[PDB]
Design a protein around this ligand. Sequence first.
Ligand SMILES: CC1=NN(c2ccccc2)C(=O)C1
Ligand SMILES: [Cl-]
Ligand SMILES: [Cl-]
Ligand SMILES: [Cl-]
Length: 163
Amino acid sequence: GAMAPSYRVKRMDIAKNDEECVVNAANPRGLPGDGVCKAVYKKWPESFKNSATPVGTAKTVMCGTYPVIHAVGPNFSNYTESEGDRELAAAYREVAKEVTRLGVNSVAIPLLSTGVYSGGKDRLTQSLNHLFTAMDSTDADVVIYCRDKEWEKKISEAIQMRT
Ligand SMILES: CC1=NN(c2ccccc2)C(=O)C1
Ligand SMILES: [Cl-]
Ligand SMILES: [Cl-]
Ligand SMILES: [Cl-]
């Protein structure tokens, strides 16, 4: 565990993270995909051996000794708001279980079910609150990665609000 477990946000490519493991915003089929998933495939392609897993789950595959936690959030184009919310909360609970099991002191994590799984809705607050619900009982330093300047400010505000 970290001496003083924290949350931080950075606006940059999660493939360049400075943490002990990474969470991939994966598809259920273990395909290279697009966005974060494609960046993760280019950086850690070995971690996509037998990475397919159902929606609402996380599956860890090593790239050398570096753990890639493939977390599959729901695609809100396909799920109802209710069932999508339940699956999104579940994926983050499975990430917290894997982070704990691995014994890492830090993890790099994107906001699940934003971008192409958002069903065209702004889900910053929904996704980030599920992240906090799962990760608050863990003692890893959490570094959230985003690409948008306005999202950086909103995530930073939400972190600082609760300190
Ligand atoms: C930046 C981002 N904007 N969005 C977004 C998507 C739909 C509606 C509004 C906003 C993301 O998911 C990431
Ligand atoms: Cl970058
Ligand atoms: Cl997404
Ligand atoms: Cl973003």
